[PDB]
């Protein structure tokens, strides 16, 4: 029991999405963002380990292969419940455990309708992402209108 | 200018959604969350006025007929980009104008692929949601589980 074709393609999609060089490597800083864009946010420590097992050679970079292999060995102990909870956490501002039913709806049904699973990828590529994955949303609005 | 049938149908789906009771009548807050669930955050004077306009008999509620009448007068002054802007603002937790690309991708492609429009509506109905449209997200996580 390994990673299906879809999973692989998912990891490949997230990695490439935050790998501006277009080559096949990403800094340790971008690793955290790649993970979060996958639904699992690692602790500063968990990420640290990952960077070591891969490029503990202080080079700071990570190759898609070394990353894919790493993702497979850890994709064993990973329940779908974690990823979903992270998705809802995005709506929790104060972190108090609650979210607005309205925002949830408006984001899932409205904005989800106006955007295809492939337009989000492109908009992020075209837009200029921060070194922490942070983006100025007016760019998404400007390109959607 | 008249409202399309798709419009009318949304205003009706949202109205009944947050009308926990069953009587085509909702409170001032329920109104606010209904309209936010449609992509249009209304001002607190704006809401008060939509209620003081109709329910000027003490109750402090509003029914679908008048709701739709106002929405018709309201929609004639609202556009599409402002609904997009509000969906992205959902991501800017601190209101600095920036959001996490990682987070945006995750809830739009991952979470948004694990459920449909009716599921979101179905889940919102089965979930305990207080007067502010606020809901404990652990519920949604469990419903999906």
Curated annotation (Swiss-Prot), chains A, B:
The modification Phosphothreonine is found at residues 43, 109. PROSITE patterns: EF_HAND_1, EF_HAND_2. Pfam families: EF-hand_7. The modification N6,N6,N6-trimethyllysine is found at residue 114. Disulfide bonds: none annotated. Ca(2+) 3 binds at residues 92, 94, 96, 98, 103. The modification Phosphoserine is found at residues 80, 100. The modification Phosphotyrosine is found at residues 98, 137. There is a cross-link at residue 20 (Glycyl lysine isopeptide (Lys-Gly) (interchain with G-Cter in ubiquitin)). Residues 75-145 are annotated as: Necessary and sufficient for interaction with PCP4. It comes from the Eukaryota. GO terms for cellular component: calcium channel complex; calyx of Held; catalytic complex; centrosome; cytoplasm; cytosol; growth cone; mitochondrion. Residues 6-41, 42-77, 79-114, 115-145 form the EF-hand domain. The modification N6-methyllysine is found at residue 114. Belongs to the calmodulin family. Homotetramer. Interacts with CEP97, CCP110, TTN/titin and SRY. Interacts with MYO5A and RRAD. Interacts with USP6; the interaction is calcium dependent. Interacts with CDK5RAP2. Interacts with SCN5A. Interacts with RYR1. Interacts with FCHO1. Interacts with MIP in a 1:2 stoichiometry; the interaction with the cytoplasmic domains from two MIP subunits promotes MIP water channel closure. Interacts with ORAI1; this may play a role in the regulation of ORAI1-mediated calcium transport. Interacts with SYT7. Interacts with MYO10 and MYO1C. This protein has four functional calcium-binding sites. This is Calmodulin-1. It comes from Rattus norvegicus.
């Amino acid at each position: 029991d390994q990673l299906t074709e879809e999973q692989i393609a998912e990891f490949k999609e997230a990695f490439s999405l935050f790998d501006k060089d277009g080559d096949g490597t990403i800094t340790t800083k971008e690793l955290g963002t790649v993970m979060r864009s996958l639904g699992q946010n690692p602790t500063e420590a968990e990420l640290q380990d990952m960077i070591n097992e891969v490029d503990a050679d202080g080079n700071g970079t990570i190759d898609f292969p070394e990353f894919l292999t790493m993702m497979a060995r850890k994709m064993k102990d990973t329940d779908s419940e974690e990823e979903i909870r992270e998705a809802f956490r995005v709506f929790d501002k104060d972190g108090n455990g609650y979210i607005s039913a309205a925002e949830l709806r408006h984001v899932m049904t409205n904005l989800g309708e106006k955007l295809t699973d492939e337009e989000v990828d492109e908009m992020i590529r075209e837009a200029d992402i921060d070194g922490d994955g942070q983006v100025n949303y007016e760019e998404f609005v400007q390109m959607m209108t």
